[PDB]
Amino acid sequence: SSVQTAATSWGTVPSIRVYTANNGKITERCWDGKGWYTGAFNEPGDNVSVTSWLVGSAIHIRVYASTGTTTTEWCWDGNGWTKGAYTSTN
Amino acid sequence: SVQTAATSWGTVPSIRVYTANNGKITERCWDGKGWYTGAFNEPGDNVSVTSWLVGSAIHIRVYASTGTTTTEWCWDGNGWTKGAYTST
Amino acid sequence: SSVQTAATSWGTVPSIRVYTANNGKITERCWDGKGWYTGAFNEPGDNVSVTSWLVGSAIHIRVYASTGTTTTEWCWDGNGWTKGAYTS
Numbered sequence: 001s002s003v004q005t006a007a008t009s010w011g012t013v014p015s016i017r018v019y020t021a022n023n024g025k026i027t028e029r030c031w032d033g034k035g036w037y038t039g040a041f042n043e044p045g046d047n048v049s050v051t052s053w054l055v056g057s058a059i060h061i062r063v064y065a066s067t068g069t070t071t072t073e074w075c076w077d078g079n080g081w082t083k084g085a086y087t088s089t090n
Numbered sequence: 091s092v093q094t095a096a097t098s099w100g101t102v103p104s105i106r107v108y109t110a111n112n113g114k115i116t117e118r119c120w121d122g123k124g125w126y127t128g129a130f131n132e133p134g135d136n137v138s139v140t141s142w143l144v145g146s147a148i149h150i151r152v153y154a155s156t157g158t159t160t161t162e163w164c165w166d167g168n169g170w171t172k173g174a175y176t177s178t
Numbered sequence: 179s180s181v182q183t184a185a186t187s188w189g190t191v192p193s194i195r196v197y198t199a200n201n202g203k204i205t206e207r208c209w210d211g212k213g214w215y216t217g218a219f220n221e222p223g224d225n226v227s228v229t230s231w232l233v234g235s236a237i238h239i240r241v242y243a244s245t246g247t248t249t250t251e252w253c254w255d256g257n258g259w260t261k262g263a264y265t266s
């Protein structure tokens with residue numbers, strides 16, 4: 001009955017990204033200091049986790065989206081979302 | 091099962107673990123010298139958290155969800171306040 | 179139903195650890211720059227969260243595994259996983 005979220009942040013402003021799994025879809029809300037807005041990330045999933053790291057000022061985000069026993073990694077490296085190499089044998 | 095979320099900062103470290111249990115989220119805290127129950131108390135069934143340092147000051151954001159509504163709670167050095175977060 | 183995951187990362191390679199809870203078993207997949215591999219972590223739980231911090235170049239990881247209302251902390255401090263003092 002309740003949605004499931006994952007959050008990450010970086011720098012001191014900060015920037016924040018909050019991912020929500022709702023009815024099989026994961027969407028993203030974003031803060032960069034002046035208001036929340038809807039982000040580009042939109043992929044299937046019933047469960048989400050996230051981690052991120054900086055290289056200098058460049059953010060790198062990895063979102064782990066799961067449906068059933070299948071987890072797909074999605075990558076942001078400054079220039080759009082792409083599927084990552086992660087696999088598991090769940 | 092209960093649902094948890096964890097964050098940490100520095101090198102001591104400090105850790106905060108948030109647990110959703112039967113619609114209530116509570117907080118356990120480590121600052122190097124034993125666990126204790128923190129001030130955070132808010133309703134929710136699922137929880138996530140992030141935190142960042144500004145120099146030596148910690149800032150924490152906890153995202154508490156009930157049904158389709160997620161409420162953000164903010165620690166900025168003196169109590170927890172409702173944040174600007176909204177979602178559709 | 180779906181598996182439930184938690185993730186942490188460190189440094190600039192980076193290293194990543196992803197924990198998956200699946201029918202009461204939590205396992206770990208690891209990235210250190212050249213491929214994913216299955217890590218040493220194997221503990222029971224229906225829910226998992228994680229946090230980590232560097233002390234110099236040394237990674238320290240805390241995984242919070244829950245079954246019912248009992249959360250167990252598992253600690254990586256450089257040479258295997260040990261149970262932690264976290265209580266709630």
Ligand SMILES: CO[C@@H]1O[C@@H](C)[C@@H](O)[C@@H](O)[C@@H]1O
Binds near residue numbers: 017028059
């Ligand atoms: C600039 O794009 C915004 O920030 C990136 C870091 C991602 O979170 C993306 O989905 C979002 O729309």
Ligand SMILES: CO[C@@H]1O[C@@H](C)[C@@H](O)[C@@H](O)[C@@H]1O
Binds near residue numbers: 075085086194209
């Ligand atoms: C370069 O490879 C990409 O980034 C790494 C840090 C990992 O997240 C990997 O699975 C992904 O495909």
Ligand SMILES: CO[C@@H]1O[C@@H](C)[C@@H](O)[C@@H](O)[C@@H]1O
Binds near residue numbers: 106128129130
């Ligand atoms: C000093 O207060 C303790 O630490 C803060 C950073 C918060 O986690 C608060 O809820 C907790 O009671």
Ligand SMILES: CO[C@@H]1O[C@@H](C)[C@@H](O)[C@@H](O)[C@@H]1O
Binds near residue numbers: 013014016151173174
């Ligand atoms: C200053 O605004 C507060 O802190 C920001 C970093 C965000 O968490 C925002 O939603 C919150 O209301």
Ligand SMILES: CO[C@@H]1O[C@@H](C)[C@@H](O)[C@@H](O)[C@@H]1O
Binds near residue numbers: 237254
């Ligand atoms: C070197 O060992 C690998 O990395 C450690 C940091 C842990 O994640 C461990 O479970 C994993 O097998």
Ligand SMILES: CO[C@@H]1O[C@@H](C)[C@@H](O)[C@@H](O)[C@@H]1O
Binds near residue numbers: 264
């Ligand atoms: C040294 O103590 C160990 O590490 C601390 C950072 C905590 O995670 C504690 O519960 C654990 O037993």
